[PDB]
Amino acid sequence: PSLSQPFRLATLPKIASLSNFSLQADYVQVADGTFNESTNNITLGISGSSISQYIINPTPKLTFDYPIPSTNIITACNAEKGQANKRNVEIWAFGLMVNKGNYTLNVITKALFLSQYKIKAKAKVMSIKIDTKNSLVIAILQNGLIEIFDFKLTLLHSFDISYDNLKYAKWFTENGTEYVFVLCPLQDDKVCYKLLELTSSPIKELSSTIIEGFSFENSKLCYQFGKLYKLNQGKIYIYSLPHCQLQQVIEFPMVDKLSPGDDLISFQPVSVNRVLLTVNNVIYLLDLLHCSTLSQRELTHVKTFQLLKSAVINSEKSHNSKTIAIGISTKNGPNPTSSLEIINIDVGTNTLKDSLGKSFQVVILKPLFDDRVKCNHCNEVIEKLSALQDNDITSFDDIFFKELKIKEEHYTEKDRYISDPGFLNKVLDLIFGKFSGNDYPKTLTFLLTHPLFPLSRTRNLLSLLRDQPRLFKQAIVTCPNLPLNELLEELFSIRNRELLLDISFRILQDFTRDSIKQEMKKLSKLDVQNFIEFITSQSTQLFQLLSLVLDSIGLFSLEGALLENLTLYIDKQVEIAERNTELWNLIDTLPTYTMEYLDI
Amino acid sequence: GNARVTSGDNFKHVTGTVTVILSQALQSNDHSLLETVLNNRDERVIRDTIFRLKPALAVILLERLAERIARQTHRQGPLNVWVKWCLIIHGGYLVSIPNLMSTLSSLHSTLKRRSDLLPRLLALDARLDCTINKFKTL
Amino acid sequence: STARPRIITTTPEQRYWRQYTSAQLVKEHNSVTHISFNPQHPHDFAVTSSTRVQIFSSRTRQVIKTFSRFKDVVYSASFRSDGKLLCAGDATGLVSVYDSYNPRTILLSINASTHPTHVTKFHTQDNKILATASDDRVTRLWDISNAYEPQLELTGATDYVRTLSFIPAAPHLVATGSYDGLIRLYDTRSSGSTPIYSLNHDQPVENVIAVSPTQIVSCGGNNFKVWDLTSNKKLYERGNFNKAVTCLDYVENFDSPMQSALIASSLDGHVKVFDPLDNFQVKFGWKFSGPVLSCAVSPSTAQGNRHLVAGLSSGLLAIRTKKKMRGSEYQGDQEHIIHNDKVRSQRRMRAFERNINQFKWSEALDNAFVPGMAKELTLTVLQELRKRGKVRVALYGRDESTLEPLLNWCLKGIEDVRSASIVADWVAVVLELYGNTLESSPVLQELMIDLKTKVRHEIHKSKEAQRIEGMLQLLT
Amino acid sequence: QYKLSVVSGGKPALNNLSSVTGNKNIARLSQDQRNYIIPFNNQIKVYSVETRQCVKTLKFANNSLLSGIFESIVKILLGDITVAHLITVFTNNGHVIVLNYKGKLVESPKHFKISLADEKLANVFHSEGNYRILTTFKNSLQSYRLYALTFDDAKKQFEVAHQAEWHNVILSNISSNGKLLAHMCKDHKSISVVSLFDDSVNLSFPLGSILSSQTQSLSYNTRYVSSMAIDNMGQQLAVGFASGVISIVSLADLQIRLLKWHIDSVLSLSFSHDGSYLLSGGWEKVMSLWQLETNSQQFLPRLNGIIIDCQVLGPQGNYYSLILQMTENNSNSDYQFLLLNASDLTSKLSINGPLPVFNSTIKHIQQPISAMNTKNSNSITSLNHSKKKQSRKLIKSRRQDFTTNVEINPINKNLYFPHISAVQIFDFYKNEQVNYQYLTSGVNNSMGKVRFELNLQDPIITDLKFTKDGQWMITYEIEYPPNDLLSSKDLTHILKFWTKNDNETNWNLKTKVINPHGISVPITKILPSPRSVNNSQGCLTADNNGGLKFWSFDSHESNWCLKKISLPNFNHFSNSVSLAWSQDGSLIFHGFDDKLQILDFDTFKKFEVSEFTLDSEIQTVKLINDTNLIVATRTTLNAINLLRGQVINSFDLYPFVNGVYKNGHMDRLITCDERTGNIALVINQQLTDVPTINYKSRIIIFDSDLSTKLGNFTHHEYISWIGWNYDTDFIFLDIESTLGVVGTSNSDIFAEQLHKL
RNA sequence: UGCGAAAGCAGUUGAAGACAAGUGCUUGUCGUUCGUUAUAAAUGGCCUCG
């Protein structure tokens, strides 16, 4: 999963209503019909400017524009392509409100103007759905009225939800049937939720419920695939349709630090259980099922970025993992300029693989049983050790072994308690600062045998202990997760015969033939030739290592002169090896007349 | 019953030259014609025919030899020299191949089985020599 | 108590084609050019050879009708869909229509052109219309009623047209393939005489066949390509053939594990089977003495023994065939209760299996080494005795006379990879069990001397195999 | 929330007393001969012979008196002694309990208590209102005393009167009628026969007179008696020897008659009621009816196990009752009771409990006596040494795994036990075996192994697993070569894929892979794939070399094939490998030796932290939920959040689990639900003042991440295995073969009279 | 027997009592004990119902 760099669609006009950045997302509407995974067009209603259709690819361009007076506020916009009485047409429906005195519902038809119609709406228009199949336009009003119109804006049906001051209405389709649910604030933070089915009445009420503790004033709402998401005070509340029952509450600590009033937050869905969250100029891709931050991007060149709409992927059925999201970006400076921007988003595969190690949420051995059967203070130690004088080996070892009751200079199964990594790392840091040069404490030898030796300290380890042979030998035999790069470098650099065999045995045991072979190519041709000369001068772990060399070196790089000496050597060993095999197997494995002397 | 037996090493689902006859037989999947070419035992002929054989056709030749050896193990020896020279001569071409094990899976399995006999054959040989030495001196 | 367990001792598509075991090679006077199968029972097939057409009985596999009226060479023997009527072409250009199984009478005779008429085929959906192709390069469409003028005269081939095909489910469409390398599609519904479109084969077209309503397979030159008319492009192409492919036939919905099969002649002596489902990939092939000019297989509804027919330029005709107390019978239909307990007898056991069941360990080993005994079967009895823990027991009461049969097989079995390990075990015991008898028996001694040479030879091969194994790793 | 309760049954009970031979079977056939009563270690089952089903079950736990009393049943007698479906149960201690079958068990049975002074009741019997009891009192030879039992109505008490006494009883037998007793004593040895209700028969003679001189020349096997039978009339006595030779002795004049067919020791001898036929059985797995008139013999071969006991059970000898041993399983003695119809020698009723194979022998189990000491048998001398060695191993040694592999069929919930070379399908809901299938080649039922043939080892089914769909069965087998050969050390590892339609009961083998992963390399771990990948038709197999192989079922091939491989040729070996797969199928967690790796499934290689080091070798890796992963090492267990890559909880296991179990068995001790949480099971030896044989197990329910203990329960015996049923409840198998569960008018008068008539 | 991988690495196979045979002495055995992690061989082979 990744977030692409935003690319510019258009620059918003310098209108007073758009000057208020915090409410700016409210003044820009995105048509649902034209903005999806497969569409290359976006229809956007910019209040007081126009309703404009742009093509995204290959380059952003303005394809159509319908001007609107500056004093009109766009409250709802939608555009859909279809067949009307049959010609292919694009039906545009938008609602504008002028000073709250009058509300205008307008329908425009374009050939792919064929006709333009306008009526007075009783109240503010928030959601507009275009049914091209039935040639219908459906509008939801603030007085709770759901009015169905044709393309000529002739009222065909009207439904009253019995509740006023509606705030949220979202359309969705399930199993081929069109559905809408609405949220109407009530007093005392109570909200009426209603679910309606579109088919004497084409609108059927399926569910009506009141949800307690649901505030709107500081809550951001979005819906996706039968789930309603509410972001409030850093906690995302997940409600499940058709009953809108609360399922899960997910805490988002990175939002809990936000001072109330200054930080601008937008919240939109992008895929199944995945949403986009923006905090000022930082954009987050979140996985809500696993509660992991899939991706994060900061837009240093803009003050704030507000999500307007996102093309949501149905990842369960769609093999495509790439979508787009459109938002408004505000530049830094004395004369801030707000512009429309689109971001390409890679949601991912929706698997636990994506969310591995990316949680946005931030030990001691405990007895198995709290309380006649057969039996088979880290900080204090750190403080005591750190207080020691420089280069005092005897005191350092005495404190470590005595305090921890360690009986052997090497790790044993009875030392499971010390296995806390934090204490070991500090002791390792102390040993380096406390001691340098040629004398190290015995505590280092114990740590080298510890299975949980920190990975951070494995690098350059062989170099530090190169001076002391025994300590180097201990590292080869027992030190865990030693890098192969250092092991191979020390393989070809060390002339000690004993160390070479141990290094050979360690490399094979912990690393694959394929993994070793690639690094061997990086080694210089001279070093491998020197190693070959050493061989010509348990042995399989050296020879099998040599066979890896002959594979790494390759056919061309080998030289005939040295190759002959190697051939003479190998033929010598094969004769001997066959001879010994014969020895091993061997270890595993009457006359008619006869003359005899009688004893008497 | 009718269950299909297999092994874990089946990496399948994971003048005097006869070069022209060999190339035609390999292209046409002609089992009879290929058999006549493989009938020769003269090592000098084997190198020369493989030497002039086009590198592309060499890969399938290894496949055909792998199958023929597997069906009849008695011909493992005589067909090994065919394989041995193919690797030597066309080694450069074989290196520049995206995948070998999948296409040379049969060869590796066939060669693996022969090596497994070596540890036990030595054990049998030592006991034969131990008894063979015994009566010969007696 | 439980019944005693029984001792336990390619592709299905290949196994089906292996059932055409019976082979008959008939000799004809000249090259057999065309072979056709009667669509109706008994599905007798006709072969065009020299100046005569011979119909062969399916069951009898011998000639039953001969049409020798033709003066010059004959070029076709295709039957009509009903099978009553067969048409034939002649080098003189006369097209002669005879009643099947009534050679004497000539129902209709048409002079297509002065040049030879190589192809004459009945139109599959419509019985009345007959198509003829000539070296005049006009593939005239004749009707049985109208014998004085063709219904339609398709033209536009600049070389010989020797391949006519009729597309199933498209009776208006007609396909022609000329030695220009162009396969032309015509529509009889329109005025015709001009192709709808042409398909380029790049090589002379020897036979065009419509496998399915939308797929046509055109075999020309050294390869055959399958074309889809909706896409108007070759989907797939196969060039496994060496010589120039000549003839091609298709059969569908027959009793094989493969629903459909596609046979194509090679002119190299090869005819190979292709299945349309698996991207037209090879599954089987047969080799003949000489080049194959015509191949045919019995229709789907043969209703009896299936036949595979191959035609060779030498005149040899090769046929492969896949062959297909008055109350004792009461059966108790009217009775209240039927009680059944009869249990069929187990499959007959061999001598070695009986001996093992009866605990005859030594005799079981003897049955292993008998003349005319399968090598695989000899391996099982040896493995069984080892599994039973009876190896020394089977070898106790033996001397040199009865030990040589085992050593003879071991001398040969050591070469086999499968039996190499088994031979080592048995040979190890007999040496450990008959060391003293070995010294006093000369014949046994030589049985080891050659064995030591052979086991040494295997050691060299296994060492050699390890070396090729080593270098093969280097390449990868 | 959770609760523990026993569900299924256990092993059938036997009179496990060394001296008594031929009276081992305690089950009885009703007087109407319409049902068979069999005592189990934890219940009494009444099976209807005609329909071959368990019509009634009397569980000791349900009844208070039986729960307090249950000590083992020494006999069952039809009817009530004190006084038509009553039975009197006599236990070894002396409790006499009058129960009823064919009805509802009464919560107040007529409990009584025979008075015995330092005596262990061994056997009881009757002919007509007269009752005798045999009791054991204490050279390693127990002595016997014969009392006479009578019930006095006034005092409602059982009174015992001394009748007879014998010392140093080596072997004993009672006639079929139950009125004569033959016994061998060391007073080398002498045989004496005594009439038990009368003084008519009283004879004794040294065994030396019976024994042939050639036997005195030969080894001790020829002179060692393993079986003894006495005729009803007392005229004949059959002695069976460890050599396999039977000798019928005519008691009137001590004339001998030798019958020789058994190649190995004869274990069971029994006379017919008329005395004209002799049932014999032994290691051959073949029951022989010797016709004594003509010395002929009829055979019933290929029985399920070696015959411990034979009896002719009926007024006219309608049935034969046999006890079978199944000596393949050395860990436990697997007894099976077989009731055969004498007419056609077909199994009229076969009864046996669950047959688990534990890793090591348990409690005081001793293999049966044979002519030679083998892996499946004890010689005459080896018996005492083996008993002492077994007790010393159970006391002093520290390796006490006794852990068994068991599987649950998802579709059917049947319980699969991998018996040696065969799988036992056992339905714990009905508490009846449903099938026994041979899943390997080998000498399994072709013949009865005898003497050195008994040293052969049949293929061992090591791992047995089902796919999530449940339609496929994956089996892993090891075939052991015979000894004394060049190829006597090259084990053959086999993998087999079986399939079965739900309606049928027999698995059909579909594919077979010989030497998977290479030659002589074990398949240490197998994990069927999750439902996400290939719809649960794939599996992973992992070696001790760190190699992984992914097989899947391809429809085109119509058989399984090796889709993916990762063969890192590590140079070290370790049997401590565990394997887990994410539910989605994206990641696979492979723990080898001390290191855990996260391999992406698509590339089947490491993700691009993948490597996690543990203090000691990994025994188990499991993910209770997609978020959390529980990793168990030999010294502790830890919970890790994959999302955070941090340890939440760590619990020390070293005090309880240090070297008690071999590597890989903690996998079968630990299981996890996919919804609620996981479960950990810890067994501790119990000792007071050196370790004792008895064990105590503790089960702990843990929530995901092991934050809290949902429940902590204690069971009084060593729990061999615990797994999670596909319902919420967990099923655990206990070395007593007990499967428990831890989970959340004139007309009316005339009608009655007519019914009576 | 312990550990471990399957290869292998370490470590054991003692004392008393009784009986038999041979000549107090010798040998062999143990349905006898204590302690330690700690060849075989009684001519004797598997049913019937096609």
The Cα–Cα gap between A135 and D57 comes to 74
φ/ψ region of A107 (left if φ > 0, alpha if ψ in -120 to 50, else beta) reads: beta
The Cα–Cα gap between D8 and D731 comes to 10
| CA pseudo-torsion sign D172, D175, D177, D180 | negative
Nearest CB to D303; choose among C1, C3, C357: C1
D659 sits within 7 Å of strand E by its CB: yes
Does the N-terminal peptide bond of residue D410 adopt cis geometry, omega within 30 degrees of 0? no
What angle do helix axes C417-433 and B105-137 make, rounded to 10 degrees? 20
Q: Which residue of C has its CA nearest to D458?
A: C387
Q: Which residues of B touch D515 (CB under 8 A)?
A: 7-9
User: D644 vs chain A: nearest CA distance in angstroms?
Assistant: 5
The Cα–Cα gap between C160 and C25 comes to 32
How many CB atoms are located within 10 Å of the residue A263 CB?
12
D231 sits within 7 Å of strand E by its CB: no
D388 sits within 7 Å of strand E by its CB: yes
Q: Which residues 550-589 in chain D show a CB within 8 A of chain B?
A: 554, 557, 559, 561-565
The Cα–Cα gap between D302 and D296 comes to 20
Q: Enumerate neighbours of D (3 or more CB pairs within 8 A).
A: A, B, C
User: What 3-state DSSP class applies to C402?
Assistant: helix
Distance C391 CA to E45 C1' (A): 17
Q: What is the resolution of this structure in A?
A: 3.0
Nearest CB to C389; choose among D301, D441, D453: D453
Please report, for residues D59, D65, D74, D75, the alpha-carbon distance to residue D105 in angstroms, rounded to integers and kept in the order given.
9, 11, 21, 19
Burial-class residue A78 by CB neighbours within 10 Å (0-12, 13-18, 19+).
Answer: buried
Q: Which long-range contacts (CB under 8 A, 24 or more apart) does D84-90 make?
A: D87/D28, D87/D37, D89/D39, D89/D44, D90/D114, D90/D121, D90/D124, D90/D133
D210, two tokens: 């019976």
Q: Are A352 and D626 in contact (CB under 8 A)?
A: yes
Q: Which residues of B touch D549 (CB under 8 A)?
A: 8
Burial-class residue D12 by CB neighbours within 10 Å (0-12, 13-18, 19+).
Answer: buried
Q: Enumerate neighbours of C (3 or more CB pairs within 8 A).
A: A, B, D
D88, two tokens: 């009197």
Interfacial residues of C (vs A; Cβ cutoff 8 Å): 470, 473-474
Q: Enumerate neighbours of B (3 or more CB pairs within 8 A).
A: A, C, D
User: D726 vs chain A: nearest CA distance in angstroms?
Assistant: 24
Does the N-terminal peptide bond of residue A58 adopt cis geometry, omega within 30 degrees of 0? yes
Q: Report the candidate in D155, D181, D72 with the shortest Cα–Cα distance to residue D120.
A: D72
Q: Which residues of D touch B105 (CB under 8 A)?
A: none
D390 sits within 7 Å of strand E by its CB: no
What angle do helix axes B31-38 and B76-89 make, rounded to 10 degrees? 90
* HSE, side-chain direction, 13 A CA sphere, residue C120: 32
| CA pseudo-torsion sign B62, B63, B68, B72 | positive
Q: Report the candidate in D709, D717, D713, D707 with the shortest Cα–Cα distance to residue D738.
A: D717
Q: Are B90 and B56 in contact (CB under 8 A)?
A: no
> Residue C299: what are its φ and ψ, rounded to 5°?
-60, 175
**Helix H or strand E encompassing B114:** helix B105-137
Give the list of residues 6+ apart from residue A416 with CB closer than 8 angstroms, or none. Answer: A365, D615, D635, D636, D652, D654
Q: Which residues of D touch A358 (CB under 8 A)?
A: 643
Q: What is the separation of C-alpha A389 from the centre of its chain, rounded to a whole number of angstroms?
A: 47
D223 sits within 7 Å of strand E by its CB: yes
The Cα–Cα gap between A398 and D639 comes to 34
Q: Are D339 and D319 in contact (CB under 8 A)?
A: yes
D434 sits within 7 Å of strand E by its CB: no
D139 sits within 7 Å of strand E by its CB: yes
The Cα–Cα gap between D587 and D527 comes to 13
Strands (E), C259-417: 260-265, 270-275, 281-287, 292-297, 306-312, 316-322
Residues in chain C: 476
Interfacial residues of A (vs B; Cβ cutoff 8 Å): 555, 578, 581-582, 585-586, 588-589
User: What 3-state DSSP class applies to D130?
Assistant: coil
Q: Are residues D511 and B3, on separate chains, in Cβ contact within 8 Å? A: yes
D341, two tokens: 């119809």
**Contact status of D347 with chain A (Cβ, < 8 Å):** no
The Cα–Cα gap between D420 and D357 comes to 8
Q: Which residue of D has its CA nearest to A545?
A: D571
The Cα–Cα gap between A415 and D250 comes to 75
The Cα–Cα gap between D40 and C403 comes to 57
Chain E footprint positions (protein CB, under 7 Å): 1-7, 29-38, 40-47, 49-50
C259 sits within 7 Å of strand E by its CB: no
Q: Are residues C468 and B27, on separate chains, in Cβ contact within 8 Å? A: no
D225 sits within 7 Å of strand E by its CB: yes
Q: Which residues of C touch B132 (CB under 8 A)?
A: 448-449, 452
The Cα–Cα gap between A307 and A215 comes to 21
How many CB atoms are located within 10 Å of the residue C11 CB?
10
Which chain D residues in 263-292 sit with Cβ < 7 A of strand E?
Answer: 263, 284-286
The Cα–Cα gap between D221 and D264 comes to 10
Way the structure was solved? cryo-EM
Compute chain B's Rg from CA coordinates: 19
**Helix H or strand E encompassing C209:** strand C205-209
Q: For chain D, what is the largest distance between any 2 Cα atoms, rounded to a whole number of angstroms?
A: 93
Give the list of residues 6+ apart from residue D42 with CB closer than 8 angstroms, or none. Answer: D6, D9, D10, D59, D60, D61, D70, D736, D738
User: D448 vs chain B: nearest CA distance in angstroms?
Assistant: 25
Does the N-terminal peptide bond of residue C42 adopt cis geometry, omega within 30 degrees of 0? yes
DSSP-derived letter for residue A359 is B
- Which residue intervals of C31-79 are DSSP H helices? none
Nearest CB to A585; choose among B91, B95, B123: B123
Q: Are residues D626 and A352, on separate chains, in Cβ contact within 8 Å? A: yes
User: What 3-state DSSP class applies to A531?
Assistant: helix
